[PDB]
Amino acid sequence: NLGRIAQIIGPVLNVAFPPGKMPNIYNALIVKGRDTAGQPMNVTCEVQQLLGNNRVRAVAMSATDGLTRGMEVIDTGAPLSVPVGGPTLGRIFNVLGEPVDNLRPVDTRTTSPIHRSAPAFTQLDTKLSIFETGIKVVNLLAPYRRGGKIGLFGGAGVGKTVLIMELINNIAKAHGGVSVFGGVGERTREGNDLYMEMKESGVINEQNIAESKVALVYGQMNEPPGARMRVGLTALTMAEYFRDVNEQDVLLFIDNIFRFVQAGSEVSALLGRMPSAVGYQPTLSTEMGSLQERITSTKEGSITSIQAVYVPADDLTDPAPATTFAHLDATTVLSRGLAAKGIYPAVDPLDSTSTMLQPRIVGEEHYEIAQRVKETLQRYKELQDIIAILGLDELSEEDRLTVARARKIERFLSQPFFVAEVFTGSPGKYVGLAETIRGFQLILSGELDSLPEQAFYLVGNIDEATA
Amino acid sequence: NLGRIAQIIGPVLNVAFPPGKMPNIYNALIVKGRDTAGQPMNVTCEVQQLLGNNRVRAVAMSATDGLTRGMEVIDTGAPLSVPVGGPTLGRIFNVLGEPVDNLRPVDTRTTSPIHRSAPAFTQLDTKLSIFETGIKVVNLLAPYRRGGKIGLFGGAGVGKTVLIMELINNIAKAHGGVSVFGGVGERTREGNDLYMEMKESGVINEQNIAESKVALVYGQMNEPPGARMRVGLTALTMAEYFRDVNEQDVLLFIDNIFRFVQAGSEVSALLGRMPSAVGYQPTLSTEMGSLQERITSTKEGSITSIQAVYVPADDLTDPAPATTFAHLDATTVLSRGLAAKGIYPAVDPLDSTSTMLQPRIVGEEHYEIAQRVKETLQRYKELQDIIAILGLDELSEEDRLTVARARKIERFLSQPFFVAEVFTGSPGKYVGLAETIRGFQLILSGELDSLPEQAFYLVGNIDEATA
Amino acid sequence: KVVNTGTVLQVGDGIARIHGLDEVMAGELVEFEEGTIGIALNLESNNVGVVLMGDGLMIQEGSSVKATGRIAQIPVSEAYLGRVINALAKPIDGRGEITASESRLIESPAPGIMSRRSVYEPLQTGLIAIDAMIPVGRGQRELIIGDRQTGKTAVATDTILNQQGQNVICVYVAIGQKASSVAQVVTNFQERGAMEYTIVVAETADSPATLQYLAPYTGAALAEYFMYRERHTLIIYDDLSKQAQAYRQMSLLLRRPPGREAYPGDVFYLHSRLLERAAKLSSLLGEGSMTALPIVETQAGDVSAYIPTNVISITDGQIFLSADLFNAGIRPAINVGISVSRVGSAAQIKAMKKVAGKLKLELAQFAELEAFAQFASDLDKATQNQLARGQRLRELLKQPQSAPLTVEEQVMTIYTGTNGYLDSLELDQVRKYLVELRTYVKTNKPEFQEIISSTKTFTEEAEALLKEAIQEQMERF
C-alpha cells in the first residue's frame, strides 16, 4: 500500500494510510528515503497498532535518522520474511535476513515469517534424555534435557558467554546435527570472536564445499530497539525450519534473551502504553512467551536451546529475568560473590535446578550424591554466619567434618575452561558424568579427608586432585 | 510592557502579554496590586517559560496571596537587578536587593544582573594555596585550596552551621579581604545570631565610618520558593563584583546551598515539567551548575566559597546533595553516628577529601601522617564488627595496638569550638597545621601508648593531651 | 513558507516547539532568528520539537526558524592535536580557528563484525598495576570505575601522558567537569608535551544540557578520523554518569516516558552507540584502532546502580578503584581483586607475561589469606611466605601520581620483588628502593634497559646480569 509518515518520535513511526488500506498488525512496512544524499530501503518497520483515525504505529528495525514526514510507506502484504533453509549455514544474518558477512547474496529456496503459531498441544513430547556438558556442576546438580530449554542466568559479567562457548565447544562442535546462535543484544567482539574461532575449528566453511552445521544471526548492542526485540525471532525462524522441515535435532544458542526484553521495554512506553512492575512493559509476559514455545522440541524433531539471561542489578526478583524461569527445564544461576571467590564457573550449587534431577531418568548414584553434595553445602552455608563469629572450638567433631568436606566440595566444584584458558592459566579438562559422580562419591565418603582444599581447586578429575 | 495575570496557582504566575510583547526568559516582571487594602510593588517575578499562545509563565519572589486575574504586569526590559559594590557591606539584603536591616536606603553606584555568564576557559587559574582553618581534621585530612569551593555536607543537625561560624571566626574575621554570607533557606535565628555576634566582633560598622568587610543577603525558610532559589544569586552577584571589579579576594559563605535546590524542586512540577530521580526537577544539574562556576577564582582575583549542603534523610545517594560533589576541591561529610558519639566536629575522618592532599602542594609529613592516621582508622573500622563479637583474646599484640592508637586518634580528632562553648563546656582551641601534624606524629609513633583515651578527647594540642 | 521556515511556538526550559517545518528530518539542525542552533527529535503531527543548543533565553515566540538541512556535522582534521575544543568543535582556548578539510557526523554507524579483529596490540598506561594484571589493548573498551576523588582522572592523566610520540592519538572528553579542574589538567599535559597529540572536547557544568550529550559523541568522531586512517586512538570520556544524567534532562523536558531512576527508555543506547564505535578494524580497513577508557562515578561503592550496571555490561574489563583502600598506602588504589580484562593477557608482550602472569598467580593467592595476617597468631610458613611476598608486591604496585613508568622500567622493577629479592626486606621502606634502583639502572645501566625493549623479553643473560644488578643493589640499602 502507500501511506505517508506522520510522526517520527525516535524508533517509532506513525504512518498514515487511507481509510481502505490498513496494514495488519505485525505486517511489516517499508519506508523509501533516508541517509545523507542517497536513496536506500533499509528503513523497515513492523505494524504494532492501529491508532485509529486511519493510522498505524510502528517500530523501525533500522535507525530513523534522516527520515521526513510525507515520505511514502508501503504495505508488503504480510510480515517480515527472513529467508530460511540450508543456504543460511556458515553465513551471518541481519534482523531482516540480509547477509552481513560479505560473502555474496544468500541463495535460499524459500523465505519464512518470523511470526508463526507455536506447536499444537498434540505436537509436543515427553522423552527425557540427558546432555552431558563437561562441567562438574551441570550434569551432576542440574542436567540438560534434550529438547529442553536451558536457562543460564547471572549478573553483569559472571561467565554466561564463556559458558555459552564451552557449550558450543563441548556440545555444538561435536553435535550430530545443525546449530544456530542468536545474537541478541550483546558485544560485537563476542561475535567476531565466536566467528574467527568457529572458523578455525572448521564449524564454518573452510571452503565452500558447504559442510557447515551452524547459522548465525547478529543484531548487537548498537542496533535500535526494534531489532534485538526480533533478531531472536530470525535466529528462531531459521531454527523452526531445520526442526520440522529437515526433521533435524537443532541447537539454539541465544547469548542473552534478556536484551530481547530490555529492547522490548524501550518501544513500549515509546508506543503509548502504561509501564508495569519495574518500568517494564504491560506486555512483558506476552512477548517473551510467544517466542519461547516455538523454541521447542516437537515430534517432528527437536530444539535444545541453551539460553542466557541478564539479571538487572543482581536482582532475581526483577520482572524480566524472573519471567524466564517458567520456560525452563533447568537453570544455572551464576553468583557474583561466588565469582568474587575465584571459583569458576561461578555456579551456585544450591541455586540451579533441572527437571531431570530424578532417579527415574538418571540414576541413584547420580541422584543421591547430587543431594549429599548439596546437603553439606546447606550445612556449611548455615554454619558460616555461626562459626564466622562463634569460632570452631566448641563445634562437634561430627560437624567440623562438614566444613572440611564441604570446602573440598566447593573447590572440587571448580573447573577451568578451554575458552577461559586466559582467566585460569591452566589447561582445561572435560569432566563427564561418571568421572564427576565417582569423584564426589570419594569425597562424601571421607576417603580424602587428608587431602588439602587447594588440591581440588581448578582440577580435572579426582585423580588430578590427588597429584 | 503591559500584560495581564491569567493564572495564579501558588508561587507561579501565568502572565499574558500581546503577540508583540514577549518578556525574554529570565527577564523579571513586576505586578501592581496585592495585600490587604494598600498598593505595593513587592510582587516581582522572573520569566522562565514562553508557554506559547501569547503567554509567559513565571515564579514570584514574593507571596502571591491577595493577587487577582487581570492585574497588570510589566516587562522591566531586563533581568532582576541587585545593587552591587562597596555600599552593600555592613548591610542586610533582600532577594531583590532591598535593605532589610533598617538603616536607610542603599546608596549604590550601579546595579547588577544576577544572571551572568561564568568566566571563560581562559579566565581560570591553577594556583593551589592552603587555607589553615584550625580544626584537627580539616587542614590535615582534607585541606582548603584558595579560590577553591569547599563542600560541607551533613544531615539534619550535625554541626554545619556551627562549622560555617568557626570558619568565619577562624578565617573571615581575620581575612585580609571582603567576605559575603548567603542566607539560603535556613533559620532566622541563624541570621540574628550571626548578626549580633559579627556586630560585637566589629566586623560590621560599629559606627558608620564604614570599615566593614562583610555583606549579608538573607532569604530564610519562611520566604516562598522563587526566593531561596535565587538569594544565592544575589549573595553571588555582589561577590562577582568584589572579585573582578575591585580585584579583591572574597569569601562566599553560603549556609546550605541545598535549600537552593529544594526550593528549585518546588517550582519545577509547579511549572509543568516532569519530575526526575527522587522527585527532583529534570533541570537539577543545569541549575546548581550555572551558579557554582561563577562562584570561583579567576585571574582577576579570587573566591573561596566555604559552602554547606543539606543531606535528605542521611542519604548521600540522593540527587541534590550528590550533585554538589563534582563542584568541590574538597568535602567534609559529617556523620550522625559519629555525632552520636560526642566527637565534635562530627567529621568522618574517612569521608572528607581535598584535591590538595598531595605532597607536591603541602608536604610529606603532612601527607604521610594524614594517610597513616586514616590507615589505622580503616584498620579499627574493619576490626570493629570482628572484635565486637570475636572479642580480643586471640588478637595479635600487633593488632591490639591498632585499637588503642586508633581510639586515641579518633579522640584526638575531637576539638571544642569558640562558638560551641555551649555544647562542649570547655574553652576552645585553635589548632593549626604544625601543631596538628606533629601531635598525630607523636601518636602514630607509640610515644603515647601509655596515655588513656579520654586524654585526647576535647583537647587543644598534644601537650593539652598530656596534662 | 511552511516548508523550509516556520515560527517558534514556545521556548520552555531549553527546548523549543517549532510549528510548520514540514521538510525537516529526524536529526536535522534548524536555525533561529537570534542565531541559535538546535537539533530535531520530535517530528510530531503538526509541530516540530527542537532541543536547543545554548542559552534559549534569546528565542522569542514568533521568531522564525530556517532549516539548515544539515545533519549535525562536526569538522575534523590533524589541525587540532592540542586545541581545547568545544561541543560543536569551536575553540575555547583562544588560539584562533581550526583548519578543517573534511567533516564527519557526530552520530554514525560503528564497525561491524567483519570489519574487526581481536585485540593483539598492547597499550601501555605507565601503571604497574594496570598493564600487568589489567591488560588493555588497542581497540578494546576498558572502563574505569570509582566514587568521588578515587584517582580515576589520574589514571587517565598518567595514561595519555605515558604515550610515546607517533604511537597513539588521544582524545580527552570532559562531561560535567569544572572549567577550572579541566584547566589544572589541560595544563599538566602541556608541561610534559603530551598535548601535541591530545584533544580536549569538554563541556562544563554551566554549558546547556543539549551539548553534554554530544560531548562524548564529538570526541568520538574526531577520534574515528584516526581510526579509518590506519592510526590508533585512546579516548577517555570523563564520567559517562554525568552524560547519562544529562540525557535524562532532555527526555523529561521533551515529555518522554521515564523509568528506573527517571532515566528514559534509551539510557543503554547512549553508551552502546558510543563505546561500540571503538574497536580494532581488520587489516582490510587499515589496521586502525581506538581504545576507550570511560569513567563512571559510583555512589558509596554501589556498583549495581543502573548506569554503572549498564556500562560494565558493554565494556571488556574493569579497573575498580576503592574509597576504603586509599589512605592505607595504596596510591593509586587499584582493586586488582575485582579488576578484570576480557581481552586477556593477549594485550601484552612476552616480557610482561613472564613476570606479570606469575605476578597474577601470586597476588591472587595472597587474596585468599590476606585477612589472616592481622590475626595470624600461629600460621605455617607455607602460608607465611605468602603474607610475606604479599604486601611487598603491593608497595611496588603503589605509584606516585604524574610519573608513568616505561615498559622497561615496568618489567625490570617487578622482576625485583617477584623473584625473592625484596623479600626479607621491610615494607615501610620498599618504595624508596625501587625509586633509587630505577634511576640507578637508568643512570649507570641504561645499556641493559635497551636490551630489554628491543628484544622485548629478558634473555638468559640479562636475567643474571639483573641478578648481579638488583642483589648487589639491595645491598646498598
Any idea what the CATH number is for the domain that residue B460 is in? 1.10.1140.10
- With cell 575465584, the residue in question is A342
Q: Which of C107, C116, C364 sits opposite A188 (nearest CB)?
A: C116
Indicate yes or no: CB of C205 within 8 angstroms of CB of B285: yes
Q: Please list, in sequence order, all residues whose beta carbon lies within 8 angstroms of the beta carbon of residue C438, skipping any fewer than 6 positions away.
A: C405, C409, C412, C413
B102 and B67 belong to one structural domain = no
Smallest CA-to-CA distance from A405 within A354, A353, A452 is with: A452
A348 and A361 belong to one structural domain = no
Amino acid sitting at position A355? T
A186: its cell numbers: 550483546
Preferred mutation among A384, A387, A389 to probe B, highest tally of B CBs within 10 A:
A389
B16 and B139 belong to one structural domain = no
First CA to last CA distance, chain C: 84
A60 and A86 belong to one structural domain = no
Is A186 an active-site residue? yes
Smallest CA-to-CA distance from A191 within A220, A167, A154 is with: A220
A98 and A135 belong to one structural domain = yes
Give the SS3 label for residue C183. helix
Q: Which of C265, C276, C342 sits opposite A222 (nearest CB)?
A: C276
Q: Which chains touch A (3 or more CB pairs under 8 A)?
A: B, C
What is the Cα–Cα distance from C289 to C118, expressed in whole angstroms? 11
In this structure, how many other beta carbons lie within 10 angstroms of the beta carbon of residue B336? 14
Q: Strands of C265-401 (E only): list them.
A: 289-292, 295-297
Q: Is position B155 annotated in a ligand binding site?
A: yes
Indicate yes or no: CB of C309 within 8 angstroms of CB of A156: yes
Q: Please list, in sequence order, all residues whose beta carbon lies within 8 angstroms of the beta carbon of residue A448, skipping any fewer than 6 positions away.
A: A408, A442, A462, A465, A466
Domain's final residue, options A79, A112, A146:
A79
Task: Give B-chain residues touching A391 at CB under 8 angstroms.
Answer: 390
Contact (Cβ atoms closer than 8 angstroms) between residue C290 and residue C223: yes
Q: What CA–CA distances, in Å, run from A333 to A337, A384, C277?
A: 12, 21, 32
Indicate yes or no: CB of A67 within 8 angstroms of CB of C26: yes
Measure in Å the smallest separation between the Cα of A323 and chain C Cα atoms: 19
Q: Please list, in sequence order, all residues whose beta carbon lies within 8 angstroms of the beta carbon of residue B446, skipping any fewer than 6 positions away.
A: B401, B405
The 3 state secondary structure assigned to A80-146 is CEEEECCCCCCCEECCCCCECCCCCCCCCCEEEECCCCCCCHHHCCCCCCCCCCCCCCHHHHCCCCC
Indicate yes or no: CB of C327 within 8 angstroms of CB of B274: no
Amino acid sitting at position A48? Q
Indicate yes or no: CB of A270 within 8 angstroms of CB of C257: yes
Q: Would you give the DSSP letter of residue A280?
A: -
Instruction: Say what the resolution is, in angstroms.
Output: 3.2
Task: Give A-chain residues touching C342 at CB under 8 angstroms.
Answer: 189
**Residue A154: closest CA among chain C residues belongs to which residue?**
C313
Task: Give C-chain residues touching B284 at CB under 8 angstroms.
Answer: 249
CA angle A338, A341, A345 (to 5 degrees): 60
Q: Is position A156 annotated in a ligand binding site?
A: yes
User: On the CB side of B147, how many CA atoms lie within 13 Å of its CA?
Assistant: 19
B276 and B337 belong to one structural domain = yes
In this structure, how many other beta carbons lie within 10 angstroms of the beta carbon of residue B70? 8
Smallest CA-to-CA distance from B230 within B191, B273, B295, B183 is with: B183
Name the C residues in 172-211 with CB < 8 Å from any B CB.
Answer: 176-180, 182-184, 187, 204-206, 208-209
Indicate yes or no: CB of C93 within 8 angstroms of CB of B50: no
What is the Cα–Cα distance from C209 to C207, expressed in whole angstroms? 6
C306: its cell numbers: 543502573
What is the Cα–Cα distance from B226 to B42, expressed in whole angstroms? 13
CATH class of C71-348: alpha beta
Indicate yes or no: CB of B289 within 8 angstroms of CB of C205: yes
Secondary structure (DSSP) of B17-62: --SS--PPTT-EEEE---SSSS-----EEEEEE--SSS-EEEEESS
**Run of H or E including C174:** strand C169-175
Task: Give C-chain residues touching B350 at CB under 8 angstroms.
Answer: 323-324, 327
Q: Please list, in sequence order, all residues whose beta carbon lies within 8 angstroms of the beta carbon of residue C103, skipping any fewer than 6 positions away.
A: C73, C74, C75, C76
Indicate yes or no: CB of B399 within 8 angstroms of CB of C375: yes
Q: What is C1-70's CATH topology?
A: Elongation Factor Tu (Ef-tu); domain 3 (2.40.30)
A398 and A329 belong to one structural domain = no
Q: What CA–CA distances, in Å, run from A426 to A429, A436, C321?
A: 9, 19, 28
**Residue B58: closest CA among chain C residues belongs to which residue?**
C12
Give the SS3 label for residue B206. coil
Q: Which of C259, C260, C313 sits opposite A310 (nearest CB)?
A: C313
Q: What CA–CA distances, in Å, run from C352 to A463, C128, C292, C440, C456?
A: 33, 10, 22, 21, 9
Give the SS3 label for residue A296. coil
Is omega for the bond preceding B345 within 30 degrees of 0, making it cis?
Answer: yes
Contact (Cβ atoms closer than 8 angstroms) between residue A281 and residue A273: yes
Give the residue numbers spanning the domain of B40. 1-79
> Would you say the C-alpha torsion A159, A160, A165, A168 has a positive or negative sign?
positive
Smallest CA-to-CA distance from A262 within A288, A244, A240, A236 is with: A288
Indicate yes or no: CB of B331 within 8 angstroms of CB of C246: no
Smallest CA-to-CA distance from C360 within C94, C49, C134 is with: C134
Amino acid sitting at position B79? P
Indicate yes or no: CB of C300 within 8 angstroms of CB of B316: yes
Smallest CA-to-CA distance from C259 within A285, A319, B325 is with: A319
Contact (Cβ atoms closer than 8 angstroms) between residue B251 and residue B177: yes
Task: Give B-chain residues touching A394 at CB under 8 angstroms.
Answer: none
CA angle A401, A403, A406 (to 5 degrees): 105
By what technique were these coordinates determined?
X-ray
First CA to last CA distance, chain B: 73
Indicate yes or no: CB of C114 within 8 angstroms of CB of A102: yes
Backbone angles phi, psi at C391, to 5 degrees: -65, 0
What is the Cα–Cα distance from B211 to B181, expressed in whole angstroms? 17
Do strands B179-184 and B249-255 pair parallel, antiparallel, or not at all (unpaired)? parallel
A352 and A365 belong to one structural domain = no
* Catalytic entry in B46, B166, B186, B223: B186
Indicate yes or no: CB of B285 within 8 angstroms of CB of C249: yes
Domain's final residue, options A326, A356, A386:
A356
Question: Taking the domains of chain C in order of start, what are their residue ranges?
Answer: 1-70, 71-348, 349-477
- With cell 617477584, the residue in question is C418
Indicate yes or no: CB of C364 within 8 angstroms of CB of A342: yes
A400: its cell numbers: 567440623
Secondary structure (DSSP) of B385-439: HHHHHH-STTS-TTTHHHHHHHHHHHHHT----SS-TTTS-S------HHHHHHH
Task: Give A-chain residues touching B389 at CB under 8 angstroms.
Answer: 389
Task: Give C-chain residues touching B275 at CB under 8 angstroms.
Answer: 252, 262
Contacts of A400-405 spanning 24+ positions with Cβ under 8 A? A401/A446, A401/A449, A402/A376, A404/A449, A404/A453, A405/A376, A405/A443, A405/A444, A405/A446, A405/A449
**Run of H or E including B112:** strand B110-113
Domain's final residue, options A37, A54, A79:
A79
Contact (Cβ atoms closer than 8 angstroms) between residue B415 and residue B462: no
What is the Cα–Cα distance from A261 to A257, expressed in whole angstroms? 7
Secondary structure (DSSP) of B329-387: SEE--B-STTTTTT-SS-B-SSS--BTT-STTTT-HHHHHHHHHHHHHHHHHHHHHHHH
A222 and A325 belong to one structural domain = yes
Any idea what the CATH number is for the domain that residue B93 is in? 3.40.50.300
**Run of H or E including C241:** helix C240-253
Q: Which chains touch C (3 or more CB pairs under 8 A)?
A: A, B
Q: Which of C10, C252, C401 sits opposite B282 (nearest CB)?
A: C252
Q: Is residue C354 less than 8 Å (CB to CB) from chain A?
A: no
Is omega for the bond preceding C332 within 30 degrees of 0, making it cis?
Answer: yes
| Chain B positions with Cβ closer than 8 Å to A | 389-390
**Residue C119: closest CA among chain A residues belongs to which residue?**
A189
Q: Which of C44, C118, C304 sits opposite A314 (nearest CB)?
A: C304
Smallest CA-to-CA distance from C262 within C248, C241, C242 is with: C248
Smallest CA-to-CA distance from C285 within C98, C114, C93 is with: C114
> Would you say the C-alpha torsion B377, B379, B382, B383 has a positive or negative sign?
negative
Task: Give B-chain residues touching C400 at CB under 8 angstroms.
Answer: 359
Preferred mutation among C214, C273, C313 to probe A, highest tally of A CBs within 10 A:
C313
Architecture of domain C349-477: Up-down Bundle (1.20)
Measure in Å the smallest separation between the Cα of B382 and chain C Cα atoms: 10
Q: Please count the residues of chain C.
A: 477
Q: Is position A157 annotated in a ligand binding site?
A: yes
Measure in Å the smallest separation between the Cα of B451 and chain C Cα atoms: 24
In this structure, how many other beta carbons lie within 10 angstroms of the beta carbon of residue A134? 22
Backbone angles phi, psi at B104, to 5 degrees: 90, 170
Q: How many CB pairs under 8 A join B and C?
A: 167
Torsion of CA C206, C208, C214, C215, to 10 degrees: -10
Smallest CA-to-CA distance from A93 within A260, A220, A257 is with: A220
C132: its cell numbers: 600487568
- With cell 610519573, the residue in question is C403
Task: Give C-chain residues touching B285 at CB under 8 angstroms.
Answer: 176, 205, 209, 245-246, 249
Number of domains in chain A: 3
Task: Give A-chain residues touching C380 at CB under 8 angstroms.
Answer: none
B156 and B273 belong to one structural domain = yes
Amino acid sitting at position A191? G
Catalytic residues of C: 342
Amino acid sitting at position A231? V
Q: Is position C286 annotated in a ligand binding site?
A: no
B450: its cell numbers: 601509655
Any idea what the CATH number is for the domain that residue A18 is in? 2.40.10.170
A180 and A104 belong to one structural domain = yes
| Chain A positions with Cβ closer than 8 Å to B | 389, 391
Measure in Å the smallest separation between the Cα of B22 and chain A Cα atoms: 30
What is the Cα–Cα distance from B96 to B90, expressed in whole angstroms? 17
Indicate yes or no: CB of C22 within 8 angstroms of CB of A70: yes
